[PDB]
Amino acid sequence: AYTNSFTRGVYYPDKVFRSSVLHSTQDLFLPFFSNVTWFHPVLPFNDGVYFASTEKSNIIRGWIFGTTLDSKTQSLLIVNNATNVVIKVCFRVYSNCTFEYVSQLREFVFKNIDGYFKIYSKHTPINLVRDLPQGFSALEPLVDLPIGINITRFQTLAAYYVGYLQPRTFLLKYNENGTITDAVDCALDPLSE
Amino acid sequence: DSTECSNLLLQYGSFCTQLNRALTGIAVEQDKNTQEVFAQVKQIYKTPPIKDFGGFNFSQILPDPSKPSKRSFIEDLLFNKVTLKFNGLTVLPPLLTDEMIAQYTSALLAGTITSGWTFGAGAALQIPFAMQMAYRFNGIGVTQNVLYENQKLIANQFNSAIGKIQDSLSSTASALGKLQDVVNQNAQALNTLVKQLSSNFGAISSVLNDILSRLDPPEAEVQIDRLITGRLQSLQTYVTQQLIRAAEIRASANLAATKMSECVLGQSKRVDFCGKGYHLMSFPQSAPHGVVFLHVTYVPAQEKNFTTAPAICHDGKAHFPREGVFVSNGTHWFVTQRNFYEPQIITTDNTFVSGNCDVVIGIVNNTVYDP
Amino acid sequence: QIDRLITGRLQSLQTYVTQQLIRAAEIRASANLAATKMSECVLGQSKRVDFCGKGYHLMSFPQSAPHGVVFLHVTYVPAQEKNFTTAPAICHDGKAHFP
Amino acid sequence: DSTECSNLLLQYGSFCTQLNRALTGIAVEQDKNTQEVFAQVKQIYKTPP
Amino acid sequence: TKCTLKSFTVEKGIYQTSNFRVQPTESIVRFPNITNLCPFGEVFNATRFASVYAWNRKRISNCVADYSVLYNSASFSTFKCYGVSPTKLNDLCFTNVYADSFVIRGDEVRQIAPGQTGKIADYNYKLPDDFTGCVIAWNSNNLDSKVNYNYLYRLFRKSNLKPFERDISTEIYQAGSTPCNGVEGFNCYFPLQSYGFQPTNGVGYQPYRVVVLSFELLHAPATVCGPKKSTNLVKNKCVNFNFNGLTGTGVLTESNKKFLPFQQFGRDIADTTDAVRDPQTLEILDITPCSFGGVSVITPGTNTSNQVAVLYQDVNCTEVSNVFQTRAGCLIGAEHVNNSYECDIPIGAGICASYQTSQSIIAYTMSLGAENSVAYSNNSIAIPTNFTISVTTEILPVSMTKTSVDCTMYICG
Ligand SMILES: *[C@@]1(O)O[C@H](CO)[C@]2(O[C@@]3(O[C@H](CO)[C@@]4(O[C@]5(O[C@H](CO)[C@@H](O)[C@]6(O[C@@]7(O[C@H](CO)[C@@H](O)[C@H](O)[C@@H]7O)O6)[C@@H]5O)O4)[C@H](O)[C@H]3NC(C)=O)O2)[C@H](O)[C@H]1NC(C)=O
Ligand SMILES: CC(=O)N[C@H]1[C@H](O)O[C@H](CO)[C@]2(O[C@@]3(O[C@H](CO)[C@@]4(O[C@]5(O[C@H](CO)[C@@H](O)[C@]6(O[C@@]7(O[C@H](CO)[C@@H](O)[C@H](O)[C@@H]7O)O6)[C@@H]5O)O4)[C@H](O)[C@H]3NC(C)=O)O2)[C@@H]1O
Ligand SMILES: *[C@@]1(O)O[C@H](CO)[C@]2(O[C@@]3(O[C@H](CO)[C@]4(O[C@@]5(O[C@H](CO)[C@@H](O)[C@H](O)[C@@H]5O)O4)[C@H](O)[C@H]3NC(C)=O)O2)[C@H](O)[C@H]1NC(C)=O
Ligand SMILES: CC(=O)N[C@@H]1[C@@H](O)[C@H](O[C@]2(O)O[C@H](CO)[C@]3(O[C@@]4(O[C@H](CO)[C@@H](O)[C@H](O)[C@@H]4O)O3)[C@H](O)[C@H]2NC(C)=O)[C@@H](CO)O[C@H]1O
Ligand SMILES: *[C@@]1(O)O[C@H](CO)[C@]2(O[C@@]3(O[C@H](CO)[C@@H](O)[C@H](O)[C@H]3NC(C)=O)O2)[C@H](O)[C@H]1NC(C)=O
Ligand SMILES: *[C@@]1(O)O[C@H](CO)[C@]2(O[C@@]3(O[C@H](CO)[C@@H](O)[C@H](O)[C@H]3NC(C)=O)O2)[C@H](O)[C@H]1NC(C)=O
Ligand SMILES: *[C@@]1(O)O[C@H](CO)[C@]2(O[C@@]3(O[C@H](CO)[C@@H](O)[C@H](O)[C@H]3NC(C)=O)O2)[C@H](O)[C@H]1NC(C)=O
Ligand SMILES: CC(=O)N[C@H]1[C@H](O)O[C@H](CO)[C@]2(O[C@@]3(O[C@H](CO)[C@@H](O)[C@H](O)[C@H]3NC(C)=O)O2)[C@@H]1O
Ligand SMILES: CC(=O)N[C@H]1[C@H](O)O[C@H](CO)[C@]2(O[C@@]3(O[C@H](CO)[C@@H](O)[C@H](O)[C@H]3NC(C)=O)O2)[C@@H]1O
Ligand SMILES: CC(=O)N[C@H]1[C@H](O)O[C@H](CO)[C@]2(O[C@@]3(O[C@H](CO)[C@@H](O)[C@H](O)[C@H]3NC(C)=O)O2)[C@@H]1O
Ligand SMILES: *[C@@]1(O)O[C@H](CO)[C@@H](O)[C@H](O)[C@H]1NC(C)=O
Ligand SMILES: *[C@@]1(O)O[C@H](CO)[C@@H](O)[C@H](O)[C@H]1NC(C)=O
Ligand SMILES: *[C@@]1(O)O[C@H](CO)[C@@H](O)[C@H](O)[C@H]1NC(C)=O
Ligand SMILES: CC(=O)N[C@@H]1[C@@H](O)[C@H](O)[C@@H](CO)O[C@H]1O
């Protein structure tokens, strides 16, 4: 039950600030109008992954990342919880702890670059259900942990879109504030090219 | 401001005194260009207090005291039309301030309005503007009475034509294409020159303090050398681009100086040099990085077909026109100036006599009235 | 070591020849202007103003210089101006006379 | 058409972009030259038969 | 200028003799609050330690280790580091840090070192030959000696321990040919003994608590780094600064631009750092390159005089006879006049300097030309009554020297 990934799905590349300037960035992104595999389980992690979920009753919980998830090698086990979000390298679902971290439409972007896990999230006042409307938003609230393994599983525990990032350059327009108001995709179309 | 890089650069040689010398050369060349183009007036000419230039209206191109910049309305429009200190790059201010250039053009304009072309030759000798326009019509071949009989119409045409320029400048975008292109090219050159710093150039890292910090000096020397050679190459490229573009702009500035001389200061017979049509006069306006010439030209219109003859054969001799052309409306023959149809009775006074009838081909029999 | 020396000396020779090309282009512009002056101001009388001296051009003479040419422009400069009252036409017997 | 060379070339910077821009400027200037020299006539004129 | 022109006589003009950059003072460094610190306290002040045969290993991760607490302490008997400088790793990071703690006796501390042999080094705790780390030990007679802890060590083993190996098996050691049946007997011994830690023992026989920090530094991510000193900031003073690993020289000032809660430092254009937020106070600052510009002298020519007027380009000269600010920079040593003359030496921004009388260099706003208002009227004409013929000189270069460079003889020879 695929559905085109629209304009949405772009994140802030780096920490820097840019005011009213156009920039070109070369790293993993989610392609414009790329049919993501809406799930209504099992999901691979060939590369960085855009995860977008809508829950009226907030059924979905944290993501159980794992390279093997056979208890032989360390997992990542992002979970979330009313009071706090807890993530450990180590309820109903189960399967040498290295590191644990505890801290505080629903855009989510997860990627692993040179062993560093990065998370980008956004909250939107959605008004139309069962479709992600083409629009623009991004942020970088993240937690970095030096795992150094290639995650390949999601096992998210009431439907979520999932798309795969690809290494294609983008041109991002910057607002006066420094936020990314708009972007265009270089290889999407000859006009955008 | 890195000392070890300073030494490694020092060992390359005299490249930088050479680059600085080239850049300072083009820098002073720019001032020479502006001064050569605009400073063709010996002494700044004030315009008279009351403007009664025979019905012609110069309010738009003449300076207005109310404005603080003391530049004409069209000059301010041209300034608004265009839209014009990081690491070792400095922009030196032009020797002639914009106000000084406006004053130059105001002086030239007052001189050409009041004294015609006399001020370019020497002392400024004043003629009533109507009589000067008659001089210029004689210059383009039309007799001077044509202006005086039609002075109000010519004034209205000139005023409305100047009015059209204001609409063209204010509304039509990218009117000042060449000047804006100059500004954009210079901004592009400086911007790419600054961008080259971030480039790696084959070293481990672009930022020089970092390459210094995390390697031993013997090993760091090689990476620093790669950075230096790359940056020096980029700077040399920028300098040579500037040299060539400065040559092109010098050619354009020499052309502007020649047009200022040959068209503002005097009337020119070079066809299509200043405008389309027979050239009457031209006015200079100061744009930000250049000069804008308003060319007042005379273009004939509403032509009429006529039957013509090379000479009139009367009493066994051929009469040729002194300055006109024989024209026939079907039954009568007249002598008219070529540029303006103003017929006159063929007479011995305005037609000279040479030879006899038989030799010249195409002549027509008629009577040449003798006063 | 000879590689480093070759690269440096080659870069220096290259920048020298490029600057020589640009300077030669400037000198060619100047020489074309001098030929135009020698043709329009020595071989004839020129009406285009301030091309050859300040004032109305009478004539001009060339003189050989070491790496160039020096024109002596003979021009006519009006002086000792006098004021006069003026008028475009003259009415006589009901007809306008223009000079 | 070697990717290994192209990645190394990226480090040098905007040299290729600069060269392409200079050459395309020369290219459009040539059309401008021919247009300026020959397109002096508003409307094509035919000689009488 | 005589130096940079390679002459003892320079002509009238303005020459860019050098460049002038304000030098930075009192460089500053800043790094965010050290809120999270490494648990060396729960390793060193652990109430109970561990027997040397079952030595305890503590993995240090995801923390900032202030090693100064260790070597500035005056309560250690031995602090032997191998292949690493404890005073030099407070600005260093490690891919892996291990902390091994156990208890031995005095004459056995010398065995906790690479290339050693003995009961402890062969059967309990072995360090590799290329060991990188520190061996820290101190007397623990007041804690591990009463008249109720039970510390053990291994007596025998069929082979020596590999580095960082740990054997806790309590199987009977077979010393002879006959095989034991999990029971002690002839040529069969239990492999563990207790230490006889009596408070009245000799110093070499009293217990010593030992901590062995070992480090690894591969081309891999790291999580154990030491603390970073930070100092107060300045304003409106050209300073070399370090903000969160970003080094730069400039004048820091208050900035109206607002970052977003995640953005650290900003670049206005062309990848040049123009703003930066300090990690401590969470405040944005704007960086401006502290004033720099060419210094160029104005001289009327040596033979005329030896006076010079310095011009520091585009520098508001509140800093280094009469000092006159001009729109082209600062002028030192040139009197400013009110009247105006024709331009002699181009300074810039509509200002020229010249040498005139006593005998001083004066800077003035150049005069464009004389002012006259030719008397226009609608019926007035000015007719020349005489004339002067004038010959003028126009000089034009037409050629250059035909130089020819032998490429090969110049390059190689
Ligand atoms: C035309 O428009 O301009 C020319 C300018 O060259 C004009 O010619 C000048 O006329 C002067 C008046 O006669 C001339 O000055 C005198 O020349 C005689 C020699 O012929 C000389 O002896 C003279 O000096 C004596 O008188 C003066 C004045 O009284 C006195 O101060 C002396 O101490 C001495 O006693 O000296 C005068 O110098 O002046 C000029 O020589 C003469 N210039 C030339 C090149 O010939 O010519 C025209 O007269 C003038 N035309 C018109 C119609 O205005
Ligand atoms: C376009 C036009 O009107 N052209 C006129 C010009 O305006 O005025 C000239 C002056 O008269 C006009 O020249 C005349 O041209 C005639 C045509 O050639 C000319 O007629 C002949 O000339 C012969 C030369 O002497 C003459 O022998 C000729 O007469 C014979 O032929 C005629 C027939 O053509 C017979 O009728 C006669 O009886 C006789 O047999 O005589 C003609 O006289 O005609 C006139 O002589 C020309 N006039 C003069 C003064 O030379 O030139 C011109 O056509
Ligand atoms: C930020 O980066 O961008 C925003 C949007 O472009 C920017 O917000 C606006 O800024 C205006 C001027 O600061 C604001 O005008 C004022 O608003 C006051 C109430 O908020 C009002 O009392 C004033 O009279 C005035 O009208 O105008 C806008 O309100 C404001 N928009 C909002 C808050 O939605 O926002 C903002 O300025 C800019 N950040 C900075 C630091 O400039
Ligand atoms: C000032 C003046 O009156 N000049 C006239 C001149 O206009 C006229 O020549 C034309 O003027 O030329 C056109 C060519 O476009 C010509 O017209 C033709 O008409 C036929 C049909 O009638 C079309 O099929 C052709 O394609 C062409 O358009 O028009 C014709 O020669 C003139 N047109 C007119 C008079 O309307 C010449 C004619 O000798 O006379 C000058 O005095
Ligand atoms: C010309 O014929 O008449 C002008 C007006 O009378 C003359 O210009 C004035 O001359 C007087 C005396 O030289 C000056 O004091 C005025 O400033 C000057 N300008 C005015 C009144 O606007 O102008 C002018 O000099 C005169 N020309 C000649 C050649 O005599
Ligand atoms: C840093 O770690 O520690 C500072 C020391 O207190 C802390 O600074 C305080 O910040 C609050 C925020 O408004 C001010 O109200 C206090 O006056 C100020 N106190 C001092 C002594 O500076 O500074 C700072 O907030 C804190 N930063 C972080 C990120 O923990
Ligand atoms: C200079 O040429 O012109 C100045 C014009 O401002 C002059 O400065 C003024 O001098 C008068 C008289 O002393 C004062 O009453 C004004 O306040 C003063 N104005 C300013 C802005 O300073 O300044 C100045 O005196 C004058 N100097 C000379 C040597 O002529
Ligand atoms: C209902 C509830 O609070 N559930 C858990 C919540 O979602 O997460 C925290 C994780 O921090 C959980 O509490 C932890 O429980 C373990 C087990 O006893 C303790 O070791 C932790 O200290 C404790 N953490 C906190 C922050 O309370 O609590 C909740 O059970
Ligand atoms: C003598 C004369 O009338 N000169 C006019 C000059 O040639 O053109 C300007 C510009 O239009 C003219 O000034 C404007 O005149 C109109 C009257 O029709 C006024 O309504 C305008 O306010 C006035 N100024 C402008 C800027 O338009 O001025 C002169 O009158
Ligand atoms: C075909 C035609 O009408 N031709 C005219 C020609 O082009 O001009 C002459 C001169 O004006 C014209 O002849 C004159 O016309 C005026 C018209 O107002 C009459 O008043 C004159 O009587 C008449 N004849 C003369 C002046 O001898 O002739 C032609 O009509
Ligand atoms: C503590 O237990 O260990 C510290 C070393 O990490 C030491 O510096 C400190 O003094 C100890 N605390 C005490 C003795 O109270
Ligand atoms: C020069 O300025 O000074 C010399 C004395 O040191 C003198 O001989 C020479 O003539 C002077 N030059 C000029 C042009 O006056
Ligand atoms: C000068 O540069 O700095 C002064 C204090 O910083 C200030 O008062 C003065 O106005 C400034 N002048 C200029 C020309 O910038
Ligand atoms: C068998 C295995 O993988 N053991 C790992 C070890 O290699 C790693 O160095 C350590 C880091 O904390 O974590 C252990 O679980």
CSV table of C-alpha atoms in Angstrom, one decimal, chain D residues 10-31:
chain,number,residue,atom,x,y,z
D,10,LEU,CA,36.1,18.2,-6.1
D,11,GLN,CA,38.7,19.2,-3.5
D,12,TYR,CA,40.3,21.8,-5.8
D,13,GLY,CA,37.2,23.9,-5.7
D,14,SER,CA,35.3,26.0,-8.2
D,15,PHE,CA,38.0,25.8,-11.0
D,16,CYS,CA,35.9,23.8,-13.4
D,17,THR,CA,32.8,26.0,-12.8
D,18,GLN,CA,34.9,29.1,-13.4
D,19,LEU,CA,36.3,27.7,-16.6
D,20,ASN,CA,32.9,26.7,-17.9
D,21,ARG,CA,31.5,30.1,-17.0
D,22,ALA,CA,34.3,31.9,-18.8
D,23,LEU,CA,33.9,29.7,-21.9
D,24,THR,CA,30.1,30.2,-22.1
D,25,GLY,CA,30.7,33.9,-21.7
D,26,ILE,CA,33.0,33.9,-24.7
D,27,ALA,CA,30.4,31.8,-26.6
D,28,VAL,CA,27.5,34.3,-26.0
D,29,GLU,CA,29.9,37.1,-26.8
D,30,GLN,CA,30.5,35.6,-30.3
D,31,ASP,CA,26.7,35.7,-31.1
